Design a protein around this ligand. Structure first.
Ligand SMILES: Nc1nc2c(ncn2[C@@H]2O[C@H](COP(=O)(O)OP(=O)(O)O)[C@@H](O)[C@H]2O)c(=O)[nH]1
Ligand SMILES: [Cl-]
Ligand SMILES: [Mg+2]
Length: 168
């Protein structure tokens, strides 16, 4: 509805890390504590301002589990950014970041902007993934890095703003 650029940005990451609530927090300012596996593929949109011009962010979301049906290059097609999300309270979701990176190399453009997102920062007292460690990891792998909380809203706007500005 009037925009200068449409930037496709995808969300990826293990089931349960907060992808769907990052989407809902960013596009509708809504959060649900309930947990429910995402159905098929969804996308939602939000427009923001960058360098005086209007950026329509089209943000895709899908299930992190790829057992019976796996994500294809069509999911990633034309994506200029990826929010690769893990749960700072569940170490396994961070261990699996390498698998997501492999999936991005196989299925996404070699120059996509990748933001590593440590979500659930409000669970800092349950932290399983030290901030400094993830930050260095992002550094070595050519990713941006931010910790967010969809629940209390911390850094959610900043994460999307930053990636869309990096892309711009
Ligand atoms: N404490 C906390 N819980 C979160 C946060 N984001 C998502 N959740 C919860 O984690 C569960 C999985 O969230 P969901 O958005 O469905 O993650 P997805 O499985 O990666 O799409 C739900 O119970 C959410 O309410 C967060 O920032 N903090
Ligand atoms: Cl599946
Ligand atoms: Mg989901």
């Amino acid at each position: 509805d009037e925009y200068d650029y449409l930037f496709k940005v995808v969300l990826i990451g293990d089931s349960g890390v907060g992808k769907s609530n990052l989407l809902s927090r960013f596009t509708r300012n809504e959060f649900n504590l309930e947990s429910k596996s995402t159905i098929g593929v969804e996308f939602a949109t939000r427009s923001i301002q960058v360098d005086g011009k209007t950026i329509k962010a089209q943000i895709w979301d899908t299930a992190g589990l790829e057992r019976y049906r796996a994500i294809t290059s069509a999911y990633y097609r034309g994506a200029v950014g990826a929010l690769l999300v893990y749960d700072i309270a569940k170490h396994l979701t961070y261990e699996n970041v390498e698998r997501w990176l492999k999936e991005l190399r196989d299925h996404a453009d070699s120059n996509i902007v990748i933001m590593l997102v440590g979500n659930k920062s409000d669970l800092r007292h349950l932290r399983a993934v030290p901030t400094d460690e993830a930050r260095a990891f992002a550094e070595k792998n050519g990713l941006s890095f931010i910790e967010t909380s969809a629940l209390d809203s911390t850094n959610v706007e900043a994460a999307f703003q930053t990636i869309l500005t990096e892309i711009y």
